Each structure stands twice: as C-alpha cells, then as structure tokens.
C-alpha cells in the first residue's frame, strides 16, 4: 500500500527555506568582505576564512554526520541542521562590535556545522517523502534552494550594508539589521521544523521505500564503502574534476568582492548583482539540463562539453575584467556561471552512473567533500595571488586548473544514456 501525504510539500518547502538561509550565511560575509575588513580591523584573509570554515567543517564531519542520519532518523538531522543554523545566526547578532570578530567566527562555525546536516538531505528527503515521478523534481528543487540562498546572499548584503566606513555607528546598525533579520528567519524556520517536520510519512510513497521499510540494512561499514570508491578509477577522476569545478565556484564567490573592487571602486552593489547573475544563470543551466542529454549524447560527452565551456567562460571572464566596463562583467559573469555552476547537478548525476552497487550517500559525501577541499586550496591560493599580483594572476590560476580538469574529464570512461 503506497500513499502520498500532502505534508511532503510542507517538508520540502521548509527544508529548502532554511537551506536557503544556511547558504545565505555562507556568502553574506564574502560579498561585502571589503566592508567587514574595516569594521573588525582584520585583514581580508580572516574575512575570507569566514567562508572557508563552511568548507573546512564539512570534510571531517560529513561521515560521522552521515552515520547519524541513517541510524537516528531524518528528523533529528533536520532539527540539528536547522537548529544549529538558527543558533549560529544568533551568536552573530551579538557579535556586531569592532573588537568581537571571533564571536562572529564562532557563530559562523556553528553555521558551518549546520551545513553538514543539510547538503546530503535533498537526496534523502525526496526519496523518503515523494513518489517515483516526483523524486527527481523534489531533489532538484531542494538543491536549487541552496543555490538560491547564495544568489540571495550575493544580492542583499550590498544593499543592506552600505560601505560607510566614515561612520562606525551607522555601519554597525546596518550589520545588526542583517544578522537580526537572518536570526529571526532562521529561528522561525527552526520552530516550523520542530512542529511540521515528521520522521516518516503515513505510508511509504513507492515500492522502493516500501521495500526499505521491511529491511533496514544498518551497519553499512562506511569505511569499507569509501575504500571501494577510491578503487573505482573513473570515479576518482570524476571526484577530482567535480572538486575542481565546484572549488572554482567557491573560490570565485568568496573572492568576487576583492576582484571586482580592485578595478571597480565603489561598486559593491554591482558586485552582488554579478554574483546573483552568476548563480541564477547556473540555475537556468541546471533546469535546462536533461535537454542537454539528447538521444545522441551521453553523460561523458555532456560532462566534457560543459567543462570546456566553463573553461572558456573563465578565460573570457578573466581577460575582460580589466576593461573597466561593468556591463561586460555582467554578461561574462552570467556566461561563466551558466556552465560552471550549472555543472554541479551534472556532476552528481554522473556519479550515480559510475557507482551503482554502492550507496548514493557515501558517493555524495565524497563529492561534496572534494568540493570543500578544493575550495579551500583555491580560495587560499587565489586569495594570495590576487593580493600580490592582482586578480588576473589569481583568475589565471583558475583557468590552468580547469585546463587540467578537461584532461581528467576526458579519461573518465562510461557509456549510458539518460
């Protein structure tokens, strides 16, 4: 007996909203990194580290948090992920002072831990709650909610927080408004998660869930599973390439303010709009995907083609930033984001092909962890290069790595249609 409950729309909508807020908090500091730099008196590296802690906390905690999900239920992860997102925001609201940077970092660290109970959820939530015809749509919608948070995270802080460095009191009030508004939204979604969210629906939605209801595996031995994936040579190459692509997105998003403000003085608002254009175009590319894989293509061919366009899009973006025309950055930022951030759904769906006899959660964790590891290295390396030799040197460093990614993408061997 399979039944669909109307609560699944509430569950998916509630999760996507606080996943949106969690991604909002990740990039809210980087987009106005030039503003937070003068408020706390710290260097850009410290403000840059407010974004890497999202990546740094994910790598070790992903597997213990994954073990928490399949052994204690999905609701507890939702309570912990949304609860820590709310708690981390409230610590930030009390950190609005010129000498309380570490309180902001402590609050951001809790939000970094909140991301661990968030990124793997969309695959689980769609399968547990939705029917076979809605699993793909629900999973994509939840994933796009995280991307929407970054797009909102790009747009709002430049508007909410003007760069009024001459007036410290006015700057603190605007920053407090952003954190209080984020705290209230996160707190409300935490309360809604407490009431509306349930461990399991009334009845299994599909035969696969009904089968999983009568035979829970338990003790999956994640250590054995990760070792097998590292022996799957196509997967390891795809693991490196996806980290290069997603790590490039994290590095560009984190350092977007510094590169843009180097040539475009006093254009923080435009920097946020460019960041929104970069992410929204990838959402368009993400939605337009599937039509990419026609009857004459495959996952391998689509993966390589998008990687080439992403590499070219970075080259055009890199070599047109110095032209001192903000309108050119908009069209090049959208073109770069259409393929670079539109590849992320394709990277995951490609991994479901290489590793069928292994759990999707373990591969999903490694793919995300690869993004975090490469994101940290790219943000550190590009941030250093941008500081001494300008944005072009840091951006060229990205083109070379994406050049490496194209070769590594070509050596991945697999054949199957949609």
Q: Are 68 and 77 in contact (CB under 8 A)?
A: yes
* Distance in angstroms (rounded) separating the CA atoms of residues 110 and 346: 30
CATH for the 221-418 domain, from 1.20.1250.20, 3.40.710.10, 3.30.43.10, 3.40.47.10: 1.20.1250.20
Q: Which residue has the tokens 């204690």?
A: 72
DSSP-assigned letters across all residues of 85-98: HHHHHHHHHTT-ST
Q: How was this structure determined?
A: cryo-EM
Side-chain-side CA neighbours of 43 within 13 Å: the count stands at 4
Looking at the domain 1-206, which fold is it? Growth Hormone; Chain: A; (1.20.1250)
Q: How far apart are CA 343 and CA 241, in angstroms?
A: 11
DSSP 32: T
Burial of 106 (C-beta count, 10 Å sphere; 0-12/13-18/19+)? middle
**Alpha-carbon radius of gyration of the chain:** 21
Do 1-206 and 221-418 come out as alike in CATH topology? yes
Q: Are 148 and 15 in contact (CB under 8 A)?
A: no
Which candidate, 20, 55, 284, 253, places its Cα nearest to that of 154? 253
Contacts of 72 (CB under 8 A, 6+ apart): none
What's the CA gap between 5 and 3, in Å, rounded?
Answer: 7
Q: Where are the domains of the chain?
A: 1-206, 221-418
Angle at 160 between CA 157 and CA 164, to 5 degrees: 100
Query: H or E stretch including 295?
Result: none
Query: What region, left, alpha or beta, does residue 157 occupy, with left being phi > 0 and alpha being psi -120 to 50 degrees?
Result: alpha
Burial of 145 (0-12, 13-18, 19+ CB in 10 A): buried
209 a known binding residue? Answer: no
Residue 240, CA atoms < 13 Å, CB-side half-sphere: 18
Is 98 annotated as belonging to a binding site? no
Which value, to the nearest 10 degrees, does the dihedral of the CA atoms of residues 335, 282, 339, 44 take? Answer: 80
């Amino acid at each position: 007996l399979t039944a669909l409950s109307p609560r699944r729309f509430v569950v998916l909508l509630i999760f996507s909203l606080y996943s949106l807020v969690n991604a909002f908090q990740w990039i809210q500091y980087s987009i106005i990194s030039n503003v937070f730099e003068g408020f706390y008196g710290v260097t850009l590296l410290h403000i840059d580290w407010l974004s890497m802690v999202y990546m740094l906390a994910y790598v070790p905690l992903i597997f213990p948090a994954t073990w928490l999900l399949d052994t204690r239920g999905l609701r507890l992860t939702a309570l912990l992920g949304s609860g820590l997102n709310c708690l981390g925001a409230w610590i930030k609201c009390g950190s609005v002072q010129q000498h309380l940077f570490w309180v902001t970092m402590l609050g951001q660290c809790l939000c970094s831990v909140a991301q661990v109970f968030i990124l793997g959820l969309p695959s689980r939530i769609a399968s547990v709650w939705f029917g076979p015809k809605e699993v793909s749509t629900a999973c994509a919608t939840a994933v796009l909610g995280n991307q929407l948070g970054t797009a909102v995270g790009f747009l709002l802080p430049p508007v909410l927080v003007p760069n009024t460095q001459n007036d410290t009191n006015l700057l603190a009030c605007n920053i407090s408004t952003m954190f209080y508004g984020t705290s209230a939204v996160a707190t409300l979604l935490f309360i809604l998660t407490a009431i509306a969210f349930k461990e399991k629906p009334r009845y299994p939605p599909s035969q696969a869930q009904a089968a999983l209801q009568d035979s829970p595996p338990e003790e999956y031995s994640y250590k054995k599973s990760i070792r097998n994936l590292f022996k799957n040579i196509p997967f390891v190459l795809l693991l490196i390439t996806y980290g290069i692509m997603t790590g490039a997105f994290y590095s560009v998003s984190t350092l977007l303010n510094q590169m843009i403000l180097t040539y475009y003085e006093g254009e923080e608002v435009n920097a946020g709009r460019i960041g929104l254009t970069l992410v929204v175009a990838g959402m368009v590319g993400s939605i337009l995907c599937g039509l990419w894989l026609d009857y004459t293509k495959t996952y391998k061919q689509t993966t390589l083609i998008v990687y080439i366009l992403s590499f070219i899009g970075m080259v055009i973006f890199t070599f047109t930033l110095d032209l001192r025309y903000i309108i050119i950055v908009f069209v090049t930022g959208g073109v770069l984001g259409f393929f670079m951030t539109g590849y992320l759904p394709l990277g995951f769906e490609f991994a479901v092909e290489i590793t069928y006899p292994e759990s999707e959660g373990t591969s999903s964790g490694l793919l995300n962890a690869s993004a975090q590891i490469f994101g940290i290295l790219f943000t550190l390396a590009q941030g250093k290069l941008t500081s001494d030799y300008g944005p072009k040197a840091g951006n060229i460093f990205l083109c070379v790595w994406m050049f490496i990614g194209i070769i590594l993408t070509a050596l991945i061997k697999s054949d199957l249609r949609r």
